[PDB]
Design a protein around this ligand. Structure first.
Ligand SMILES: CCCCCCCCCCCCCCCCCC(=O)OC[C@H](CO[C@@H]1O[C@H](CO[C@H]2O[C@H](CO)[C@H](O)[C@H](O)[C@H]2O)[C@H](O)[C@H](O)[C@H]1O)OC(=O)CCCCCCCCCCCCCCCCC
Ligand code: CLA
Ligand code: CLA
Ligand code: CLA
Ligand code: CLA
Ligand code: CLA
Ligand code: CLA
Ligand SMILES: CCCCCCCCCCCCCCCCCC(=O)OC[C@H](CO[C@@H]1O[C@H](CO)[C@H](O)[C@H](O)[C@H]1O)OC(=O)CCCCCCCCCCCCCCCCC
Ligand SMILES: CC1=CCCC(C)(C)[C@H]1/C=C/C(C)=C/C=C/C(C)=C/C=C/C=C(C)/C=C/C=C(C)/C=C/C1=C(C)CCCC1(C)C
Ligand SMILES: CC1=CCCC(C)(C)[C@H]1/C=C/C(C)=C/C=C/C(C)=C/C=C/C=C(C)/C=C/C=C(C)/C=C/C1=C(C)CCCC1(C)C
Ligand SMILES: CC1=CCCC(C)(C)[C@H]1/C=C/C(C)=C/C=C/C(C)=C/C=C/C=C(C)/C=C/C=C(C)/C=C/C1=C(C)CCCC1(C)C
Lengths: 34, 45, 93, 504, 131, 37, 451, 90
């Protein structure tokens, strides 16, 4: 259920999976040359 | 065994035939212009 | 061959025939494999049981095992189709 | 010019030459019937109707001649095995020669109708163009078919004026042509009740006669005339092909599964009689009843007829043949000579063993012997494997009761293996192999060949029906589409699809 | 079932489901490549079927005999040791995969070996025929 | 097994290999964000 | 924005990387970012295999393919192929991860904010695809870089600790290669050897001396050719022969790397010198011969005359005769009689397997190696189930050799497909009909009818 | 020994229905008999080494061919080659 190794797995996976789309969304918010 | 050659008589045609074909090709190439071009391919023949 | 009457003793019944059976049939009898049976197969042809007990180089403990397994053990005429396959016989399961 | 696949469309609007080509086709079919009957009579052996019946010899139209009355021959024999002193004209040869003469007459009629194509009957009095009033033609033909069906079922089947149809018992031992009284209850829909044939034909003939009167009397509605394109003869072709492959599926089913119209003394047994152990159960029941009367095994098994034991055999199974194993069934396992009797297999302890019978799926089946409980007590190894339950080890002995080997007991291993391999196939028989040089692979019965041919023909005629319905309903765009399609294919251009008046 | 014999006298032990699962996992990891399905891929004359284990000197149809075989493997006659050829805790330097197995691990492996004949009978040690 | 000074960072190391697949998907997402111009 | 749409480039979004053909700076950025991706995978997978490494099981039983690559080169390997320390593997992974960070920053910079075309800002780096001299200069620079890499391998093998020689006496050990084979006859007789059975072309390198010597040769050849291409321009025959465009060069590279993929797949499948079986596991031939050899030993020791045991067809059941007349292992493994393994070569005489050396000169480590290799045969499934396809779901093993061979055969075929596509399109774009047939002047309509 | 080592006409189920005599024409081919034929070998020693136990010479052999497990007539084979052997302690 709650395993610290699994918790850190999910946290790292969430950060990795949301880093790139965060870059795209932030560039779109600053109206960059996307 | 280089190129599957075990008898030295086999080397005579393997070397000789490309020489004759190269002689014909060299006549063809000496007929050409043979100066550098600036294009993707040479349209001169 | 199509017809061969002496083949319930190749491992199909309790009584085991020597010089016609594989080494796998001695695994049913405890203490008869992989020792003892090697001596049986190496000097294969026997006239009867006493020939196996005499011509084989059996130690006293091996002779005690042989005394333990008298009745489920026989010696019939040799068949060369089964002599050549008394070590492998192609059975693996 | 016309392509090769449209060469017959020249008689599509020519009624006289349409009748001519129909007459030519009818003449060809009648001539095939006559010639096939003559060939089958040339190759038929009527000596032994019990072990060499007509279905073992590959007779195809002989069963259909024997189904509804024609059983005698000018040679002095009958297919029931009896001797006929005065055969009469309507024998097999008489039917064949009548078909040949009918073929010749229809050929001459076809010639006349091809030459004399411009009859005034075929031209419409209102317009003058060559036309056929197809609804009234259908009424006339339906009335004729109703009259023929009613007459057949009321005089031929019932024996009022006619021979009757072939009626056999439940196990195909005593079958002959008998008059058949109709059954008007629900038991007439029992497919194995032959009274249903007579009752069906009488009732359907009456209904078809009434419907033909109606269709002669009443013109079609305009909605049905425009919808079904009743002015076009290709709708008649499409619906006729549909009904024909419907009937072909029906006959395929009634041939494969069996009915009163496909008796086993003419077409052979079915595969489901072998699957269910039908004849085996009957034979066991008779043997048990004879044993309950104080008889021993020899007298009980000797009372079983050879026909009944011959039916309990996998070589007579229609589902054991091959697609390219051509010829009669006697070209396979051979010509049956005698029933060798029922084998009973006993081990060294006297326990009885039964060889497990081969299913119809298996080209080859392993020979295994089970006890009364169902446990493998003996078998034959595959080809050369080391064995544990072999015939030589268990000491299986076989004793035959009834038949040719009645009372004999075989104890030697090769003979016991041979008879166990025979008993795997059912009842043990004796076959002759040097007469036809039989190869030794089972061949199908006329039942199986009929089923194969007519199932494939029905499947292909489904495609034919689709093609001709398409060519009927799409006659205006036969050569292609025009420029009036581009406006209809725009999505949402019209409210109703294909209707120009519903434009948005 | 979960009940396998423990001693040679006839004592039985009831295995916990965790022991059964761990024995199955350890048997599939450390023994599967040579004992898939209860047979021996490298010496097919012997197998893990209960008849072969019971008809041996000593009989390997109990927990303690299997643990002793995993600690000191002998031949089918029993006079000759095969510790060089067969994996063992004596030869853990020879076979590196044995160095992680403890006494409870051998207990679970023996319980799995004894427990499989009662699960899908005639398939354990029957080879490819009973698949 | 990782050295014990860095054994706590195992989940990040487990996630790390599949990141180029996320780069390919990121290229597709970036093309989706500009309307596949 | 111009240059990044179909209206200004003529290429759609799914063919948008072809907008970078004439945009040199962004093309450099794409290449550097891709290099960062490759180094990132190297580091991440190395650290992944370090984190998943079990010290008890060997490398090939854990599905590891990069740790064996580092074990070939002699980091953290003891005698006999034992993995004694995985810290250098961790060092390699971390170094690659940081270097990939640097390369990714460079790729992003040059893709997004660097100059699009280098031909005006930095003329020493700018180029045109039709300019043969500059392209040959770049090719020579990269050739010299590759030669430096080959000499890095040479320096590692000869001076810095050495590499793992699986043919070393005793069972294989990390060995300094002090006398590499510099004879051009051997090195280039490897290249001219037939690729068929029993010869194997360059897959059959069976000692580290030939490997190191020919890597010296490759480094020398690459450096000499790199300076040759830096200081020369293509000759007239080469100018007539080839198409001078970026896509044509790409197609040439695609076919070269496709051939390399095929060759590496065969290396992984057959070679056990550069791919030692202590790390990658036994080959198919090695596993079959291990099974046959272990049965031979178990029957020679346990009372069975193997040389006189007639098989089911009259041939040898354990030992038979090769088609060339040598003593080989019998059975279905007779097709794999070309196998050379360090655990069997001491037991191999001039006529094949020497029976006296079989019964007398067996070292126990050879017994251990043959007993280990006979079970983990390269036979597996896509769901990672060991054994043949008719096995139950209880064995979890697929050989790393199978993975490497299948993956690189797949990629070699795919890159041959890419070569064909790009060579065709390069020819059609150079000639000028890659966008379709011209309606005004159709070449076919101006030809005579053929029949 | 026989060329091959160790009960039906599987192809023809209708052949084993003839009654009393089934598949007996195809019996000798079905009955695969292990037949151990005999042969004679005569070898002469042309040269003999004195330092070792080695001898060399020629041999003449006469034996029988494959019997197809008792399905074809064994043709006799004549073999004339060379021979070598070592004699040492037992
Ligand atoms: C298109 C969709 C592809 C995605 C598939 C779904 C992803 C998740 C499922 C999956 O993958 O499955 C989940 C697995 C993780 O599952 C674990 O996978 C393990 C893989 O075994 C490996 O490890 C075992 C011991 O650990 C053995 O050593 C075995 O031999 C070795 O293969 C075992 O199966 C474990 O039981 C299981 O838990 O992900 C993997 O492995 C990850 C693999 C992804 C990388 C694959 C790269 C391609 C490899 C080259 C392929 C060559 C192609 C040739 C054409 C074919
Ligand atoms: C629906 C079509 C059909 C079916 C099911 C059969 C069925 C059969 N035919 Mg047959 N046959 C047919 C059409 C058909 N025939 C036609 C159109 C011809 C003329 C070419 C023949 C000519 C023919 C011959 C010449 C023979 C058969 C034979 C057979 C039998 C094998 C089997 C009863 C064989 C048989 O056993 O008959 C004695 C045989 O010898 N048929
Ligand atoms: C009652 C049966 C019946 C009838 C009267 C017709 C009549 C016709 N069909 Mg038709 N058809 C049928 C069944 C039938 N079909 C079935 C079952 C199929 C599915 C296979 C088709 C598929 C079919 C196609 C695909 C086409 C026709 C066409 C035609 C028309 C041109 C005639 C023709 O093709 O000859 C041309 C001459 C030949 C075909 C001779 C070639 C010999 C054949 C291929 C093999 C020999 C067969 C044997 C004997 C048959 C045995 C019998 C038991 C079936 C004609 C109106 C054509 C059409 O509508 O054009 C406008 C057309 O294109 N039919
Ligand atoms: C190896 C993969 C790879 C690489 C390196 C590139 C690289 C490039 N592509 Mg490209 N592309 C790819 C795959 C790739 N592509 C695939 C798979 C497709 C099909 C969907 C496309 C479709 C495509 C089109 C249609 C176009 C390009 C274009 C370009 C160029 C301009 C990029 C741009 O303006 O984006 C701007 C993007 C952003 C501002 C958002 C992404 C921001 C960064 C790059 C994300 C990653 C940051 C990273 C995680 C952090 C690293 C920092 C470091 C310090 C650690 C650039 C050289 C364009 C071109 O040709 O220009 C002339 C163009 O029009 N690509
Ligand atoms: C070093 C390798 C390399 C490089 C630099 C390029 C570079 C290029 N290729 Mg190319 N190609 C390669 C290898 C390479 N290719 C290989 C190996 C193949 C064979 C599969 C192809 C097949 C190919 C085609 C068919 C096309 C290109 C095109 C292009 C251009 C635009 C690419 C683009 O925008 O991608 C955008 C990237 C994507 C949209 C991502 C797609 C992801 C795919 C669908 C994943 C599935 C792959 C699949 C499993 C493989 C099939 C099996 C295989 C055996 C065939 C660009 C010049 C296009 C062009 O216009 O050329 C000028 C074009 O039409 N290439
Ligand atoms: C093979 C790879 C490669 C190549 C050919 C280039 C080539 C170039 N880079 Mg570059 N770069 C690379 C990798 C590469 N870089 C990487 C990996 C990084 C990340 C560290 C950078 C970071 C980088 C920066 C930050 C800048 C360049 C700049 C330049 C240009 C000026 C020449 C130069 O660097 O002076 C040689 C300098 C020292 C030896 C030149 C076109 C400059 C540029 O384009 O200015 C507009 C610039 O400002 N590069
Ligand atoms: C990646 C490796 C690589 C590549 C792609 C090339 C590419 C090329 N070389 Mg080359 N070369 C290389 C490595 C390479 N070289 C090395 C390592 C050497 C040293 C042995 C040479 C020695 C060499 C010579 C001596 C010649 C070429 C020539 C050529 C050109 C024509 C080659 C041909 O048709 O075949 C072509 C540009 C020919 C050319 O055009 O000269 C400039 C030519 O005469 N090469
Ligand atoms: C480069 C490819 C593009 C080349 C353009 C020319 C196209 C050539 C078409 C190929 C036809 C040549 C067929 C000869 C091949 C052959 O089997 O030779 C057969 C000969 C071997 O020949 C045999 O050799 C035996 C050796 O004991 C014996 O001597 C036999 O008598 C002798 O026949 O092999 C070679 O010459 C190999 C030369 C080296 C080639 C290795 C590269 C091959 C691997 C890469 C290719 C797959 C990717
Ligand atoms: C091989 C093949 C192809 C694929 C299907 C299938 C597998 C079933 C198989 C079927 C093939 C087919 C369709 C075969 C057709 C055979 C046919 C139609 C045979 C018919 C022959 C007709 C005959 C003798 C007619 C004889 C008539 C005669 C003398 C008449 C003569 C006379 C006339 C002309 C005038 C009056 C006087 C008199 C004497 C009556
Ligand atoms: C030091 C330490 C001890 C043990 C623990 C631990 C392992 C964590 C270790 C920590 C290591 C660390 C923090 C490493 C840092 C790694 C980093 C920053 C890696 C990232 C590199 C970045 C890369 C490749 C990016 C390249 C960019 C690309 C492709 C962009 C391509 C594209 C562009 C240009 C246009 C659009 C389309 C697309 C495909 C998106
Ligand atoms: C010895 C050995 C053991 C293991 C490691 C080690 C590296 C040492 C290894 C190898 C060492 C060495 C020296 C390897 C050398 C490999 C070599 C020389 C590879 C070269 C291959 C050459 C190739 C494809 C040529 C391709 C060009 C072709 C077709 C033709 C191109 C064109 C022309 C010229 C004719 C018309 C057609 C076309 C297209 C216009």
């Amino acid at each position: 259920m709650f395993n610290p190794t699994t918790l850190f797995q999910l946290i790292a996976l969430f950060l990795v999976i949301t880093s790139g789309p965060a870059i795209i969304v932030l560039i779109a918010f600053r109206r960059g040359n996307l | 065994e280089a190129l599957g050659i075990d008898d030295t008589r086999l080397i005579v045609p393997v070397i000789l035939i490309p020489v004759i074909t190269f002689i014909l090709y060299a006549g063809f190439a000496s007929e050409q212009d043979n100066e550098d071009f600036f294009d993707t391919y040479d349209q001169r023949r | 061959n199509v017809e061969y009457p002496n083949v319930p003793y190749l491992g199909g019944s309790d009584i085991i025939d020597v010089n016609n059976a594989n080494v796998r049939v001695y695994t049913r009898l405890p203490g008869m494999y992989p020792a003892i049976a090697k001596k049986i197969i190496k000097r294969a042809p026997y006239k009867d049981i006493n020939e196996m007990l005499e011509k084989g180089d059996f130690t006293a403990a091996e002779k005690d095992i042989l005394d333990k397994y008298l009745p489920n053990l026989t010696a019939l005429e040799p068949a060369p189709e089964y002599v050549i396959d008394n070590i492998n016989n192609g059975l693996y399961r | 010019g016309l392509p090769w696949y449209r060469v017959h469309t020249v008689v599509l609007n020519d009624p006289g030459r349409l009748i001519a080509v129909h007459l030519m086709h009818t003449a060809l079919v009648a001539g095939w019937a006559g010639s096939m009957a003559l060939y089958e009579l040339a190759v038929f052996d009527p000596s032994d109707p019990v072990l060499n019946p007509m279905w073992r010899q590959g007779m195809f139209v002989m069963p259909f001649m024997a189904r509804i009355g024609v059983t005698d021959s000018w040679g002095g024999w009958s297919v029931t095995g009896e001797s006929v002193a005065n055969p009469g004209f309507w024998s097999f040869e008489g039917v064949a020669l009548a078909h040949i003469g009918l073929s010749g007459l229809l050929f001459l009629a076809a010639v006349w109708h091809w030459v004399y194509w411009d009859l005034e009957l075929f031209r419409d009095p209102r317009t003058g163009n060559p036309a056929l009033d197809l609804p009234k033609i259908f009424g006339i033909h339906l009335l004729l078919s109703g009259v023929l069906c009613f007459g057949f079922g009321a005089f031929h089947v019932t024996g009022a004026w006619g021979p009757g149809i072939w009626v056999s018992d439940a196990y195909g031992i005593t079958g002959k042509v008998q008059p058949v009284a109709p059954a008007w209850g629900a038991e007439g829909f029992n497919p194995f009740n032959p009274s249903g044939v007579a009752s069906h034909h009488i009732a359907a003939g009456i209904l078809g006669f009434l419907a033909g009167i109606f269709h002669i009397a009443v013109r079609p509605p305009q909605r049905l005339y425009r919808a079904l394109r009743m002015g076009n003869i290709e709708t008649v072709l499409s619906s006729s092909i549909a009904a024909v492959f419907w009937s072909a599926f029906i006959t395929t089913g009634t041939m494969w599964y069996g009915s009163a119209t496909t008796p086993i003394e003419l077409f052979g047994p079915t595969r489901y009689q072998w699957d269910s152990g039908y004849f085996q159960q009957e034979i066991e029941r008779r043997v048990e009843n004879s044993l309950n009367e104080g008889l021993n095994l020899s007298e009980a098994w000797s009372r079983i007829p050879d026909k009944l034991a011959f039916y309990d055999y996998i070589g007579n199974n229609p589902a054991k043949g091959g697609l390219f194993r051509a010829g009669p069934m006697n070209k396979g396992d051979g010509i049956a000579e005698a029933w060798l009797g029922h084998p009973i297999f006993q081990d060294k302890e006297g326990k009885e063993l039964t060889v497990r019978r081969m299913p119809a799926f298996f080209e080859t089946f392993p020979v295994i012997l089970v006890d009364k409980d169902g446990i493998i007590r003996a078998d034959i190894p595959f080809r050369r494997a080391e064995s544990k339950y072999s015939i030589e080890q268990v000491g299986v002995t076989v004793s035959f009761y009834g038949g040719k080997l009645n009372g004999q007991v075989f104890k030697d291993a090769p003979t016991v293996k041979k008879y166990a391999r025979k008993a795997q196939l059912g009842e043990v028989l004796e076959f002759d192999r040097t007469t036809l040089e039989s190869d030794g692979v089972f061949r199908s019965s006329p039942r199986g060949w009929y089923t194969f041919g007519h199932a494939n023909f029905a499947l292909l005629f489904f495609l034919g029906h689709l093609w001709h319905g398409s060519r009927t309903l799409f006659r205006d765009v036969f050569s292609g589409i025009g420029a009036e399609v581009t406006e209809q294919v725009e999505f949402g251009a019209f409210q109703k699809l294909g209707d120009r008046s519903t434009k948005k | 079932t979960r009940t396998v014999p423990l001693d040679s006298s006839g004592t039985t032990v009831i295995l916990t489901p965790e022991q059964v699962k761990r024995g199955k996992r350890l048997f599939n990891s450390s023994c599967g490549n040579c004992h898939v399905g209860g047979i021996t891929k490298t010496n097919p004359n012997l197998g893990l079927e209960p008849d072969a284990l019971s008809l041996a000197t000593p009989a390997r149809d109990n927990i303690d005999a299997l643990v002793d075989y995993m600690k000191n493997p002998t031949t089918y006659d029993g006079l000759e040791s095969i510790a060089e050829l067969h994996p063992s805790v004596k030869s853990a330097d020879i076979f590196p995969k044995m160095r992680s197995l403890s006494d409870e691990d051998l207990f679970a492996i023996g319980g799995h070996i004894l427990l499989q004949p009662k699960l899908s009978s005639e398939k354990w040690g029957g080879g490819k025929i009973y698949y | 097994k990782l050295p014990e000074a860095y054994a706590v960072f195992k989940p990040i190391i487990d996630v790390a290999p599949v990141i180029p697949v996320f780069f390919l998907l990121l290229a597709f997402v970036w093309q989706a964000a500009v309307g596949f111009r | 924005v111009a240059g990044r749409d179909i209206e200004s480039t003529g290429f759609a979004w799914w063919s948008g990387n072809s907008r970078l053909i004439n945009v040199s700076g962004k093309l450099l950025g794409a290449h550097v970012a891709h290099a960062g991706l490759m180094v990132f995978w190297c580091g991440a997978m190395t650290l992944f295999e370090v984190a998943h490494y079990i010290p008890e099981k060997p490398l090939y039983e854990q599905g590891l393919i990069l740790l064996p690559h580092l074990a070939v080169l002699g980091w953290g390997v003891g005698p006999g192929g034992e993995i004694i320390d995985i810290y250098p593997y961790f060092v390699v992974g971390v170094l690659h991860l940081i270097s990939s960070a640097v390369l990714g920053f460079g790729g992003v910079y040059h893709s997004l904010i660097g100059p699009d075309t280098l031909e005006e800002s930095f003329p020493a780096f700018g180029y045109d695809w039709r300019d043969k001299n500059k392209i040959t200069t770049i090719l020579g620079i990269h050739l010299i870089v590759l030669g430096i890499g080959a000499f890095l391998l040479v320096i590692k093998a000869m001076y810095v600790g050495g590499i793992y020689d699986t043919w070393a006496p005793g069972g294989g050990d990390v060995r300094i290669i002090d006398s590499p084979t510099l004879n051009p006859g051997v090195i280039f007789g490897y290249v001219l050897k037939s690729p068929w059975g029993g010869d194997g072309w360059i897959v059959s390198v069976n000692n580290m001396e030939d490997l190191v010597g020919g890597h010296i040769w490759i480094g020398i050849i690459c450096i000499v050719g790199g300076f040759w291409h830096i200081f020369t321009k293509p000759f007239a025959w080469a100018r007539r022969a080839y198409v001078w465009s970026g896509e044509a060069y790409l197609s040439y590279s695609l076919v070269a790397v496709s051939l390399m993929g095929f060759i590496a797949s065969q290396y992984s499948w057959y070679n056990n010198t550069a791919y030692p079986s202590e790390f990658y596991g036994p080959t198919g031939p090695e596993a079959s011969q291990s099974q046959a050899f272990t049965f031979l030993v178990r029957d020679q020791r346990l009372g069975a005359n193997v040389s006189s045991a007639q098989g089911p067809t009259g041939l040898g059941k354990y030992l038979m005769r090769s088609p060339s007349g040598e003593i080989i292992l019998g059975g279905e493994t007779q097709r794999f009689w070309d196998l050379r393994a360090p655990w069997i070569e001491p037991l191999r005489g001039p006529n094949g397997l020497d029976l006296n050396k079989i019964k007398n000169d067996i070292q126990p480590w050879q017994e251990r190696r043959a007993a280990e290799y006979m079970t983990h045969a390269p036979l597996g499934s896509l769901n990672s189930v060991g054994g043949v396809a008719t096995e139950i779901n209880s064995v979890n093993y697929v050989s790393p050799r199978s993975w490497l061979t299948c993956a690189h055969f797949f990629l070699g075929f795919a890159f041959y497909i890419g070569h064909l596509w790009h060579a065709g399109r390069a020819r059609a774009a150079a000639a000028g009909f890659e966008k379709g047939i011209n309606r005004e002047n159709e070449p076919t309509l101006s030809l005579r009818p053929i029949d | 020994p026989s060329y091959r080592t160790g009960d039906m006409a599987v192809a023809l189920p209708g052949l084993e229905a003839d009654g009393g005599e089934g598949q007996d024409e195809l019996f000798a081919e079905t009955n695969k008999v292990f037949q151990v034929t005999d042969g004679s070998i005569e070898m002469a020693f042309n040269r003999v080494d004195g330092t070792n136990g080695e001898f060399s010479g020629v041999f003449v052999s006469e034996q029988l061919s494959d019997t197809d497990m008792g399905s074809k007539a064994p043709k006799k084979v004549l073999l004339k080659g060379i021979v070598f052997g070592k004699i040492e302690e037992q």
